[PDB]
Amino acid sequence: GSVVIVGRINLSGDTAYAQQTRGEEGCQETSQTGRDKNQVEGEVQIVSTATQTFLATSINGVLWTVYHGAGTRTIASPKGPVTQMYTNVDKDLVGWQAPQGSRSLTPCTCGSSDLYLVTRHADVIPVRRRGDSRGSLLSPRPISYLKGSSGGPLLCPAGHAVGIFRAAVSTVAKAVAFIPVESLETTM
């Protein structure tokens, strides 16, 4: 079956807000056909397979997500199922050509230490950068709050993309792992 856009997250100036466009019944049927006529908008898509929901982030003209969510699946589109352009399991990274109407985030060149994880609810969670692929949460959170947010963006204060959220370190989450925008460009 195909990955399906079921909603999205829009970044408005210094804010993010979510919208739902599809429920479980529509997700299951569109996953089967791979045919999706819904208009696309936003930098972050809420995506779903038959059985898992997660996020996808547009960067550099590619809609990126995690392999552990998408597998090798196509993504539903107005012209039917679209094959992945990029698949790297070692990076836990897949990507498809970005849908017409999504807006690509700008890769960050700030070097900032303050990062902001966007969750699937448009919650913006502060994070302290610790290198290029890890971040420490300012307040620990039950991992429940972060589940379903893989493939969403870490942003810098200016709103640029720093990386794709991959996994969380926990024992309550204390830290997060993300794929740096630099690794996406190397893949590309």
Catalytic residue list contains 150 = yes
The closest alpha carbon to 153, from 60, 83, 55, 85, belongs to: 55
Catalytic residue list contains 163 = no
Cα four-point dihedral sign 83, 95, 184, 13? positive
Closer CB to Zn ion, residue 23 or residue 157?
Answer: 157
What burial class does residue 72 get, using C-beta atoms within 10 Å of its C-beta: 0-12 exposed, 13-18 middle, 19+ buried? exposed
Cα separation, 19 vs 101, whole angstroms: 15
Q: Binds 67, which of ligand ZK7, Zn ion, none (CB < 5 to 8 A, cut-off by type)?
A: ligand ZK7
Q: Binds 158, which of Zn ion, ligand ZK7, none (CB < 5 to 8 A, cut-off by type)?
A: Zn ion
Window 30-59: residues binding ligand ZK7 (CB under 6 A): 52, 54
Window 63-102: residues binding ligand ZK7 (CB under 6 A): 67-69, 89, 92
- Is 27 one of the annotated binding-site residues? no
The residue ranges of DSSP E strands in the chain, in sequence order, are: 4-12, 15-20, 44-48, 53-59, 62-66, 86-88, 93-97, 114-118, 124-129, 134-141, 153-155, 161-170, 173-180
- Is 110 one of the annotated binding-site residues? yes
Closer CB to Zn ion, residue 89 or residue 158?
Answer: 158
Tell me how many residues contact ligand ZK7 (CB under 6 A).
19
Catalytic residue list contains 69 = no
Which residues are marked as active site? Answer: 68, 92, 148, 150
- Interacting residues toward ligand ZK7 by CB under 6 A: 52, 54, 67-69, 89, 92, 143, 146-150, 165-169, 177
Question: Per the annotation, where are the binding residues?
Answer: 108, 110, 156, 160
